Amino acid sequence: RICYNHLGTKPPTTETCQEDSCYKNIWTFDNIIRRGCGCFTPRGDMPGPYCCESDKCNL
């Protein structure tokens, strides 16, 4: 599937990745959208970003 791992300062790379789930992380520390193919933490307001099992999965 495709999930981006851009921003911080440098915005061009995207992870055309093989994992069963990917996450949208919109906080970090630096107030930014920097994220990836990983996750696998049930997001029942548990430690982690919001994690989904679809291509992009809402930008």
mmCIF file of N, CA and C in Angstrom, residues 1-4 17 19-24 35-37 50-59:
data_model
loop_
_atom_site.group_PDB
_atom_site.id
_atom_site.type_symbol
_atom_site.label_atom_id
_atom_site.label_comp_id
_atom_site.label_asym_id
_atom_site.label_seq_id
_atom_site.Cartn_x
_atom_site.Cartn_y
_atom_site.Cartn_z
ATOM 1 N N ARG A 1 0.911 -1.242 0.000
ATOM 2 C CA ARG A 1 0.000 0.000 0.000
ATOM 3 C C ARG A 1 0.920 1.254 0.000
ATOM 4 N N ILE A 2 0.355 2.517 -0.028
ATOM 5 C CA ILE A 2 1.198 3.744 -0.031
ATOM 6 C C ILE A 2 0.799 4.600 1.218
ATOM 7 N N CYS A 3 1.841 4.991 2.040
ATOM 8 C CA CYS A 3 1.645 5.882 3.185
ATOM 9 C C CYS A 3 2.934 6.778 3.243
ATOM 10 N N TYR A 4 2.769 8.142 3.435
ATOM 11 C CA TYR A 4 3.914 9.047 3.267
ATOM 12 C C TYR A 4 4.848 9.027 4.517
ATOM 13 N N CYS A 17 4.875 0.558 0.536
ATOM 14 C CA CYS A 17 5.277 -0.446 1.531
ATOM 15 C C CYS A 17 4.317 -1.670 1.612
ATOM 16 N N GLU A 19 3.534 -3.574 4.576
ATOM 17 C CA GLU A 19 2.947 -3.998 5.857
ATOM 18 C C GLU A 19 1.370 -3.988 5.785
ATOM 19 N N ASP A 20 0.734 -4.975 6.529
ATOM 20 C CA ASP A 20 -0.707 -5.232 6.749
ATOM 21 C C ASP A 20 -1.470 -4.002 7.389
ATOM 22 N N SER A 21 -0.759 -2.873 7.754
ATOM 23 C CA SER A 21 -1.390 -1.736 8.394
ATOM 24 C C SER A 21 -0.455 -0.489 8.244
ATOM 25 N N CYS A 22 -1.075 0.746 8.105
ATOM 26 C CA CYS A 22 -0.275 1.956 8.164
ATOM 27 C C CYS A 22 -0.985 3.066 8.973
ATOM 28 N N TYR A 23 -0.122 4.000 9.494
ATOM 29 C CA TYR A 23 -0.577 5.007 10.445
ATOM 30 C C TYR A 23 -0.378 6.460 9.950
ATOM 31 N N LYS A 24 -1.327 7.352 10.424
ATOM 32 C CA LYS A 24 -1.356 8.805 10.188
ATOM 33 C C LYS A 24 -1.065 9.420 11.596
ATOM 34 N N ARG A 35 4.832 10.144 9.170
ATOM 35 C CA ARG A 35 4.081 8.929 9.449
ATOM 36 C C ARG A 35 4.593 7.684 8.663
ATOM 37 N N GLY A 36 3.835 6.514 8.705
ATOM 38 C CA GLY A 36 4.486 5.368 8.052
ATOM 39 C C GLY A 36 3.756 4.016 8.020
ATOM 40 N N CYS A 37 4.407 3.014 7.312
ATOM 41 C CA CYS A 37 3.877 1.641 7.236
ATOM 42 C C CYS A 37 4.331 0.898 8.538
ATOM 43 N N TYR A 50 -3.155 7.325 14.913
ATOM 44 C CA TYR A 50 -4.332 6.546 14.477
ATOM 45 C C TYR A 50 -3.805 5.567 13.360
ATOM 46 N N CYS A 51 -4.131 4.220 13.484
ATOM 47 C CA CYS A 51 -3.558 3.184 12.595
ATOM 48 C C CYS A 51 -4.733 2.408 11.893
ATOM 49 N N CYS A 52 -4.646 2.327 10.516
ATOM 50 C CA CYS A 52 -5.668 1.773 9.612
ATOM 51 C C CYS A 52 -5.124 0.624 8.697
ATOM 52 N N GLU A 53 -6.023 -0.067 7.902
ATOM 53 C CA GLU A 53 -5.581 -1.184 7.037
ATOM 54 C C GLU A 53 -6.151 -0.987 5.598
ATOM 55 N N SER A 54 -5.823 0.215 4.998
ATOM 56 C CA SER A 54 -6.264 0.595 3.655
ATOM 57 C C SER A 54 -5.198 1.542 3.008
ATOM 58 N N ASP A 55 -5.167 1.578 1.621
ATOM 59 C CA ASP A 55 -4.248 2.477 0.908
ATOM 60 C C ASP A 55 -4.676 3.958 1.249
ATOM 61 N N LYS A 56 -3.655 4.799 1.691
ATOM 62 C CA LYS A 56 -3.765 6.184 2.161
ATOM 63 C C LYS A 56 -4.439 6.162 3.567
ATOM 64 N N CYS A 57 -5.762 5.775 3.581
ATOM 65 C CA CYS A 57 -6.633 5.676 4.736
ATOM 66 C C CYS A 57 -6.742 7.115 5.328
ATOM 67 N N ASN A 58 -7.387 8.012 4.486
ATOM 68 C CA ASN A 58 -7.856 9.351 4.848
ATOM 69 C C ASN A 58 -6.668 10.368 4.909
ATOM 70 N N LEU A 59 -5.984 10.517 3.715
ATOM 71 C CA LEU A 59 -4.893 11.459 3.377
ATOM 72 C C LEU A 59 -3.618 11.024 4.206
#
